[PDB]
């Protein structure tokens, strides 16, 4: 799971996915 725009946004996971507002990836607020 390594996406810089959408990865664990809703892939049955909550790691790379901050609030849908910014980038839903661990790289940003996630």
UniProtKB/Swiss-Prot annotation:
Residues 1-24 are annotated as: Disordered. It comes from the Eukaryota. Changing residue 9 to A: Strong decrease of inhibition of channel closure by PKC. Inhibition of channel closure is nearly abolished. Phosphorylation of serine residues in the inactivation gate inhibits rapid channel closure. It is found in: Membrane. Homotetramer. Heterotetramer of potassium channel proteins. The cytoplasmic N-terminus mediates N-type inactivation. Composed of the tetramerization T1 domain, six membrane spanning regions including voltage-sensing (S1-S4) and pore domains (S5- S6) and a variable C-terminal domain. Voltage-gated potassium channel that opens in response to the voltage difference across the membrane, forming a potassium-selective channel through which potassium ions pass in accordance with their electrochemical gradient. The channel displays rapid activation and inactivation kinetics. Belongs to the potassium channel family. C (Shaw) (TC 1.A.1.2) subfamily. Kv3.4/KCNC4 sub-subfamily. This is Voltage-gated potassium channel KCNC4. It comes from Homo sapiens (Human). The lineage of its organism: Eukaryota, Metazoa, Chordata, Craniata, Vertebrata. The gene is KCNC4. The chain holds residues 1 to 30 of 635 of the full protein.
């Amino acid at each position: 799971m390594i996406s810089s725009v959408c990865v664990s946004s809703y892939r049955g996971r909550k790691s790379g996915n901050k609030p849908p507002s910014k980038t839903c990836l661990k790289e940003e607020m996630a």
